[model samples]
Target: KDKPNQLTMWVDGDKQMAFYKKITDQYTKKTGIKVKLVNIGQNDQLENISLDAPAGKGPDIFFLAHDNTGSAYLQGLAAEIKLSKDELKGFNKQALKAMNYDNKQLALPAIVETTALFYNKKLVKNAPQTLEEVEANAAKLTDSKKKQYGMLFDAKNFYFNYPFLFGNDDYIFKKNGSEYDIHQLGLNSKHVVKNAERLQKWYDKGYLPKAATHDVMIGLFKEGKVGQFVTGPWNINEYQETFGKDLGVTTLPTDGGKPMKPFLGVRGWYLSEYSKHKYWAKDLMLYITSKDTLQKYTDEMSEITGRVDVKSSNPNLKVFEKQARHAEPMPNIPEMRQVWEPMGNASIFISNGKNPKQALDEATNDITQNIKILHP
Candidate 1:
């Protein structure tokens, strides 16, 4: 018997760990490769990876997202993954581009996620075609006496609402050739103001619940008391269990008949440049992320697949396939991390009766000023 090639893998702790273990075990049986999965909490995984990569003590492969790709690439912890034409054609375009940095592909697509309009079938028979239609439906469906809400949003998650904001002619930053025209149609633009005004009106209309957080809305929706939520594939299983086939899903509607696109966070697997056995590690990465392997993964994990061909393999996958067409990949630039904390604080203001535009503008200014100091 040949000595098995040893591979170390790092992943954030989740139920998916067991699923990955099974896949890797199968790979081992076939290839004589041994994978040691290092389970770590999110923050701990970050810290440990940071420490290990520098010393070359890190994983042979690791799970990564688009948000962290820039930093990982710049740190030289990631290697260039140059795929052949056939391999490139096999993966989804968004997933392929998400891992590509400076012409170097760095990761393999794992799971892809995008938000869709989730409405209860019993309360709402058809998917609304526009934001105006959504508002009208919300008004018609609600009855305080019945303890029902027509619609509710996770007010605290600014990113959750970003799609609606952008769909209404607003953007975080505009791209002008190689540079960003940050002033054009951004968070503080007039269109953004209009977007905020729209949300504020919903808040005032009693259409949106008065809860301090999104959980109340989620609870009500699960109980068939609340009608709609704009959320990602991450919650599909929850909705499937709560409403089963009765849960109606469609792409987030737009005002001008254009598709509304959410910030997409794709999950992928990448071989570490620090790995001892790079060739065998790449083989393992390919093994788990292939069309067949991804189907198995999604079947076991209840995740949306990144392969176009695999999407048709399951009836439940139809919702995800429809949603993916309209979703935009999350901005992978380093400037994006600067938005989260301040945007979160802005959400706190919106929660306590502050104007959405004013809060977003103030948060934007604070972050812009702080980023200037931190990076300069």
Candidate 2:
């Protein structure tokens, strides 16, 4: 027997599986060890790892977002990997810290994402430079009789709404010493509340479609029914292929003079504490996630590379570079789970004619209360 040397791993979606396959093939070419890539959808992967962690039967490696680091770290599932000075020089410091929980680095960054405005050049000749311009153009562009909407977005995703919020000098949370003061800058800001109201008004004025889901908006934009939307570089391939060369891109417009700031998410693999082969596993992890590999994979995937040394060679990466300065790391707190549901409820309430301020106030209170219990 060859000593059963397969390094078992779990990953999200088919696209990621393909990336893993490419990297593993390269790793095996360099070293004879085999890598077993298990593809699971989001929820199932999370559930399986969470269940297997306590039983000591989890995969050797798993993928994680920043927000999951805190809770997963506390659960004692993640192992620490110390990076050399030379290796540390390759990755972005902020991206590296985004995966840290309580000063302990947990995961390696795979893909870092930032969003920008995407428009249909076939219908609109120029991109809007400000919120006022967006509104003015949207009014003229929409034709309700033809079922064409000027702009459409999923109001439910906080990440999607972040540009509008931040461009007005508003934010969702503020740093208070080592912790975040949730009410200091973001959801509780008067400016953000007003912007939320503006979004509702736009929704009511036929600028945005009445029946909008993530898929619906994406479809509408790709089909040229909507004029513009905000999305990340990860979707560039789909946009280029579906809508062709007429798909134009730009940064999100700001209300204040400052640029639009949106959340940036770093994707990467984490070595499980229960892995059977740490030495071979570490070697494989480094080999696959190396800067050269990241550049290669990013070129193929159209994602932003987390390594600072390697620049993406994709022709469309320029749009992301234009907006990269305003991109902030995604929240990594364990209490972050408390915000999503309540905030989602508030979005639903606002969309259905409820008071934006009142709905957000209730959501803030609800999230605060929930986090208190969860964090305790």
Candidate 3:
């Protein structure tokens, strides 16, 4: 028997903890290594781990998004996970790239996510293939007097709105040889302003509601009052139950024949640099993310796994895989944290009838100032 046969793992959410315990239980049965799952809030896990790890009180493994890898690496909170080239080849190349920061594989990819279009078959016989068609269909399906909408989504959320900016050739930060050039913020670029103006016209023309929030949009869609919506795989189970055979999914509609690229993200397992059981931790990480384990996880959770060999029978997932192929990875730089709020506020302002150029200019200036304070 091994001297130290136990490993502690930090995870967020009750469902995630339960799912992990189920998988780790299999690992324990096979390897005699017991994994203890500790529940931690998603927002608090990184800060708490950074503090507790140095004191020899942190978990051996933790779960976090790839976006956090850059900061976690800088804080010495995460360690490089060594995997054979054969092992690395099993994962989706994009996910593997996201987990790599400064040429170190900081985490093992677990799940991948990106937004796609969902349409009601009863309302839309054929899904719209282009932005112009989406608008035309929206006009046909909307009935304000009946409190019904042709389409609904959190149009002001940067995550949902990014496809338009990306399709228009605007970017948040320029990537230079795997590192982000934070100095080249593009939130207020001419192309961004053009797309922002085009998006604002949707609100002004009543195609999109100015006050619609994520909850409101989802509620409307579930009630069968919305003909279409843009959302991610997280909603698949719920929407599938509601729409049943009527639910249809596809990559975001193209813009003038160009693809609308959503932001792609991966949730993965990270090894704590402070862990005494580094080898065992890496072993468990690999075990949990292996094709078989991930397939089981996907079957149970209805989420997309990062393994390329695991295919889903779910049609929606197939569309997600296709869409993700075109999706852009969210910039992983620490400065990106400062871009969200200002950019989101600008979208809100533009939705409320502010000049798109002025709103974006102010957001860019505010983001620039905040990044300066953060870095300088």
Candidate 4:
């Protein structure tokens, strides 16, 4: 008897396993190739694959986020993926690059997540279209004595604060051709310090409260005290359950006609470099990302998936589709591991009345030191 009768994949959760089992069974019905799924954490699977693939004990495919792809690429575990240019038109452009490491397309983007403006329809009739509009809404509604505000986000958290930082052309690292220049940290630029000072003006004017933490943002939004806030699709159902038809979502208001560039996170499948069934794994991925299959997945889960033509009954996905055009994937390089803590600590100091240049320069020094000490 010939082999290649079955294929297996490592997936994240029971819910995902059930969903994959349902879909893969359909694939088997048509192709007569059995599919197996193992429940494993994403990080654990990565470490395990490093060991298992070389030992010949691994599954044919595994899934993880784009941020983890750099580590996998460096470890030499991901196999390069191929697709036709015309066929590539079906996918999100930002997602395609997230999977490409040093010119090798290593993963297929299954789902992408990005934040946008989620506003209360009762509080605002139209979605804010510009940074000026959002600020106007905040100015009109903010009442210091009432402790209420129109808009709020966690200005002290680096992830939440990134869009504003980058709106002025600041970046985490300088790009050197297809990869990032790890030696050039962009957080210490004049534009970044200027934006940090703008946040100071906002705080001083009481337009953005000093304590506008994420917890406060969410609680106030649910209480109908917040007009709009920044967040992703994962919270759509809970917010919809709370607000019903009164909730509205749109791509974030523009900064001088440019959409604020939020970080995009892509999650999808990787072909095991050691797999003999590379052709079959690619076929399975194609079927999984096809319009019909991925649409159903997005419809059932209310997720913002990878393909451009994947429509959703959930209205929020459409807005994310637009927002995706402006989104940039978080760099998947190994050097990124050193950037977060230092940048996060800097935001805290900046928020606490420390000088922006002083805070940013110190953070840049810490980031550079850590990178050389570890990744170099």
Per-candidate RMSD vs. true structure? Answer: 3.3, 3.9, 2.3, 1.9
Count steric clashes of candidate 4: 0
Clashes of 1: 0
Please write out the lDDT profile of model 1 over residues 1-376, one tens digit for every residue: 2344688888767576777888889888998778888876544554567789779788988887766776677777777776677766667777666666656678887878886788998988888888888888889877879888787677567778777666634566565422334334267777766777777777777787656366666778888987777766666778888888788887778777587778777777776777767777777878878888887776666677677766554454677776665666666656667778887777666656797788878987987886677656
lDDT per residue (tens digit) for residues 56-83 in model 2: 7678888877677776777777787777
**Candidate 2 TM-score, C-alpha based:** 0.82
Q: Give lDDT for model 3.
A: 0.85
Q: What digit string (tens of lDDT, one per residue) describes model 4 on residues 193-253? A: 8888877666767776776678778888888888878877767777889999999999887
What digit string (tens of lDDT, one per residue) describes model 3 on residues 115-213? 999999989878789988888888898887877888776879998888876664568887665667888988888888899998988787787887778
**Where does candidate 1 have its weakest 10-residue lDDT segment?**
176-185
| Candidate lDDT values, in order | 0.73, 0.74, 0.85, 0.83
Top-TM-score structure, candidate number: 4
Q: Which ten-residue region of model 2 has the weakest summed lDDT?
A: 176-185
Clashing pairs in 4: none
Each candidate's TM vs. the true structure? 0.86, 0.82, 0.92, 0.95
List the candidate numbers ranked by TM-score, top first.
Answer: 4, 3, 1, 2
Better of 2 and 3 by lDDT: 3
The regions of model 2 sitting more than 4 angstroms off are: 1-8, 13-22, 28-60, 92-94, 167-171, 176-186, 232-235, 275-280, 308-314, 321-325
Off by over 4 Å in 3: 1-4
